[PDB]
Paper text:
Potyviral CP plays a role in virtually every step of the viral infection cycle, from transmission of the virion by aphids, virus assembly and disassembly, regulation of genome amplification, protein translation, to cell-to-cell and long-distance movement. CP consists of a highly conserved globular core flanked by two large extended regions with a high frequency of structural disorder. The C-terminal high intrinsic disorder region (C-IDR) is partially conserved and packaged in the lumen of the virion, supported by the helical ssRNA scaffold. Here, we show that we can control the shape, size, RNA encapsidation ability, symmetry, stability and surface functionalization of nanoparticles through structure-based design of CP from potato virus Y (PVY).
Residue numbers in the entry:
A (entry chain Ak), C (entry chain Aa), E (entry chain Ae): 55 to 222
B (entry chain Ab), D (entry chain Af): 53 to 222
The structure:
């Protein structure tokens, strides 16, 4: 029974047959590109940094939000390590301009965060602090141990169960 | 014997027509909005979006797939997105929700049959569990054509699917 | 010990021996005839319909209240199908003039509703939506799956147990 | 859906009356003669026997008890007897059988309810198995109120009794 | 191997794909409509009754042929009950004009007879006399206990077995 209004479908099954959006582009668990660009272009201006080294700053922020979380203290600072030295940045632009929530704005790093949490597991065991605080004892699930992970149809069932365990 | 209803000695029912009055459950159900409430909504979104009488079908395709993976109770102040090839086309949700009487779920229940059909073909290429089942621990994959908020449980629905919806709900 | 006031019974056992009212005529689970007539004659006037086609409208309303219930939204509409077309009627006269409650006013259709919920089971399985929403999985009890059923001494024990299951 | 009978687009049945038309099985059954066939018989025997409109009831009492212990298919040329105290009053069977349409058994089926009642009271003093069960090896005594040729098996008849009649018959 | 005469099929598979007659319209277990109309219009004339009350007479006849059968004595009478009174009608027009057989002419009442043999089972047990004489001891099969039932693909296997038991 196709929907209809006035003797005409209100759908196109030609288009639909070939309309297949990925879940992480239609899903609301992740901010839209227009929202990501607004956040990125606002953090870039609020940090007095150009495109030359802004990507480098984003490497630290992602690695911070894997070890700390995506619900920080707005009146605080996120830390980056320039070798043995410490680099401190404000979290006002990070949280203020991250619409709707910083997790949705950080969900765009779910694939890279997954790579970096396994790319640092090679060689030596490594486990984010969103799993060490939430009682996770299995290193095989360290990949999925960060707040801004995107649960999709490709997520392992075991991974999709750690999250509900860690989230409670 | 049966006591047929009577007002002043006259049956208040027509039995010649009751025997031949078998409405499909969906047409008189209250989980679906009336076609007079769909037409008002449909036309309203055409007015708000300025989309012509053509091309609306393709906007309804984005909303249907969007309402499978997101839900039928979004924020009235947000924007739902549909993929124009590789880009992202954002539309406002105000006409969708403001003109959805009684609710968007009942307005979107008109797409239930197509919704399950869409999932199957999507699932006929690679696994596709709609987000409404991923955020609700729906683990069996066969019952992935019923993992959307605007599904109408009818007399033809598999009993499992019915039990599953009792699980996703709360 | 017969009741008495002043050395005379306050009962007539002659009459009583042969006073046997059916339960659905004395019971309060069903509106009185004077109340049914008032509701019927008010819905008839509020719908601008005569006796010629009012019975036909009542066929749809009963079939609606088997699939929806007897506690609807007063500021709403009940649907009837004139073939493939939809016929919409207000629920103001239905609920406003149904004293004490629309269920008591619709309890007069318990026998016919029972017939129509089994008369549509012949040929193809059919189950009201007051059982499909209230988790009923037995088709043999589809007859008794509507809000305005009249529980009498003739109700099967199994039927009288589905209702307490569906009612909670 | 049900296909109600129709001649030229009009149902050939009245449904307002079918719902309220529950005939007792005996009234339209064919194991019992019509009351228009009983009245003709009854009156005929009054004419043949010259018995008045009074005293016929007492002659029908002898025939009923006689037809329990003998059968409802006697010889048209015989005489059935009723006991007037201690003596024996013989009546001719010609009016009984000649005017029994379609048959005497169907004419005598009007006495079935009384017939079983008569046996019970008779059995409530000393054993009384009607000869129709003695010459047919009917051994259980409780089912002795159904051991007469003109009994009408209805929806209220005990299933045993029904099986027993299948045994007495042949 | 499609049938053919002279290099052309003698069938149309276009039509056939969508030619689906119900079994009770093609089957010979039931008289044709032209035969039913002839019988109905002959019984109507032979009974000195108009369309006003002919349907009422047909209610009694169906209920008679459920309790007696469809092979009666042509030189006889079928009984109807006008309350406590008896109404006698001839069986000459019923049987004389019922081509090919009265059962085929009464097969048109199979659906209604099924309804009325269950519509009288509600409330109190009821069993036709075509089952009480043919040794049937199961009330669940009382619906199918009449001579002019139409055995179709939708008949329950248990029902389709009572008939061969009752028919022998």
């Amino acid at each position: 029974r196709m929907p209809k209004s006035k003797g005409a479908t209100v759908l196109n099954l030609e288009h639909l047959l070939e309309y297949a959006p990925q879940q992480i582009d239609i899903s609301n668990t992740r901010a839209t590109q227009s929202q990501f660009d607004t956040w990125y272009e606002a953090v870039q201006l609020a940090y007095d940094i150009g495109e030359t080294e802004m990507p480098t700053v984003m490497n630290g922020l992602m690695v911070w939000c894997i070890e700390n979380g995506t619900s920080p203290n707005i009146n605080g600072v996120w830390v980056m390590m320039d070798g043995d030295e410490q680099v401190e940045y404000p979290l006002k632009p990070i949280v203020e301009n991250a619409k709707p929530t910083l997790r949705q704005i950080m969900a765009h790093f779910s694939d890279v965060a997954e790579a970096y949490i396994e790319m640092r597991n090679c060689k030596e065991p490594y486990m984010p602090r969103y799993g060490l605080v939430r009682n996770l004892r299995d290193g095989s699930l360290a990949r999925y141990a960060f707040d801004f992970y995107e649960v999709t149809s490709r997520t392992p069932v075991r991974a999709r169960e750690a999250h509900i365990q860690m989230k409670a």
